[PDB]
Symmetry: C3
Amino acid sequence: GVGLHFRGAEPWEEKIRAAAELGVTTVRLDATGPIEETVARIRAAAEAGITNLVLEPGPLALDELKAYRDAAPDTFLTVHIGDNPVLDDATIADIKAAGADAIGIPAKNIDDLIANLEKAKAAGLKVLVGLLPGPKELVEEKVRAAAAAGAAALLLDLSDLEVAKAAIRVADEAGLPVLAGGGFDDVDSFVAAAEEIRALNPRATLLLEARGLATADIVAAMERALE
Amino acid sequence: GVGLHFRGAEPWEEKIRAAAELGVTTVRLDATGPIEETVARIRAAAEAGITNLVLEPGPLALDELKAYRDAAPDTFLTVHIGDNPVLDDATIADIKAAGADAIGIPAKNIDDLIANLEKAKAAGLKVLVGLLPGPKELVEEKVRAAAAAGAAALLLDLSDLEVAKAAIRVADEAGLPVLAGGGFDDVDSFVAAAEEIRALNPRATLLLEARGLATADIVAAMERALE
Amino acid sequence: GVGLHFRGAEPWEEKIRAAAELGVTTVRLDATGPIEETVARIRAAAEAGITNLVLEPGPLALDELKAYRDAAPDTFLTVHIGDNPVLDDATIADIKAAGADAIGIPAKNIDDLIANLEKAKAAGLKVLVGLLPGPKELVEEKVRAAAAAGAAALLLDLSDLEVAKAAIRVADEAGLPVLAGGGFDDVDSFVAAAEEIRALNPRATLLLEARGLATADIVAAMERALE
């Protein structure tokens, strides 16, 4: 016997609560959709025990920023700016004015990485530096540059696992926390890599892409990695 | 030469009709979306020859229930209640009043499984008992409990294939039909597992997750398993 | 450390521009959605340097056709008719009247393939013939029929890679360009198959399914295949 299953798109709140009960504390959240559902998700994360929250919104007015901050006032809120490496002193103030605990800045080259780190740290913001996939030697140099120029944490979207291990190992040398993702929608591949990352860098968190997985499979993935 | 393909989301009706022509008779349908498209899908399933239909709606008023029943009056309609293991005698009547041939009940523990089976069977409803993924010994005990307490069929959302084979083998011992799914979006992995499930339990149906696959690939998957 | 990532759906324009900068020139675009976002995507493809554009719309009025043609007047626009193998002389005129450089026609059997090729070529349209997955010998005969009856190019939606290689090799014998896809959402499997297709047929383009992949991973996929 063979049949068809048309599985429904599960609410993100259910997935957030299921993971947090197992002990998950970090969620990287896309905040480009409508405000009402984004705020609702953040509130559920706050109730579930999510202590580290990384928003990735699109255009972000100060109204949106305060709404997100108020949706989880006791969490470590990090606002990711997106794509454009330009960092005007105005948008820094808005993220600062809303109570964000940190700002997320992409790293295309190192010269703008140093300038952005100077701008945001001078304005009292902790900085989470993100690296785009690239050659292994270049990524290592950017990890060192981010570390030396005062980054609080590293965001690694490196689907090349071997390159990612290299960057994570360099970050561990500097005692840099790492948020790692990329190419992890399979359950079995994730739990294997979650054991490897832990050995390379104890301060490193691996992110499961949870948008398309069933809640039960997320629980299975988190159970096998945490335990 | 390399290029980009932005494939469009295909209507579920096309996929239902394509599978039914090959001989597929069981469809597990998410019924959380708008009523008009859900009813339209059910009607196409009725025209295509779908004889076993498992709805998984969200909130479900009696108006929705009768609409679904009338969309395919000659099919074996099973209404799945969702998540909350509480089973009030009122929602049982509504599913009964609408002409549903069976009700779908989750099994978190065995004590509420026995109580829910008593409640629904006393009210003349056939019961399809669903099992969440868990330890192999626990799943087997729940299969035995469901079988002994009068379940008409088992729903297995077990992504751990080896555990799923264990539950399916225990169900075969009791002559229990099984609807099985979980982690089957790949074509090649599905057809392999479809041959294994058949040997373990002739009364067992394996469900292909069809939400993201092309219609041609669904036809290829069903052709290789049925033949 | 383990966490959740809820990645946002990235605009198709970003993916189109990222690929075109690497040198990609062919995009197969679903044109069933609203006109405004479809036209916006086509314009971005025109600006990015996409010279071969294959639209796959649903119902298509002449208003839609001219809008798409005007969104990229310097590109080789191919309009794919969809599913129904019937080819009335009226819809041929509308595609012709809008300035389309070619028409896409499915091939269920060979007799309607010959008739449709006669109809569209007599009306001055270049024809891109698409083949549905099937037995290896049948596909080869259809490639020969399409080639002998005057097809300008072949569209291959063959998830069975070995069958696809057979059709591509037969097309190379006749000097037929090929657009190939099917089952390519994984990065590593795509780049491997992109090297094999090139050897079999230099005039053959392999399409990456880009709807669900991150822009960075698309860049990684295109970099490894082009170089």
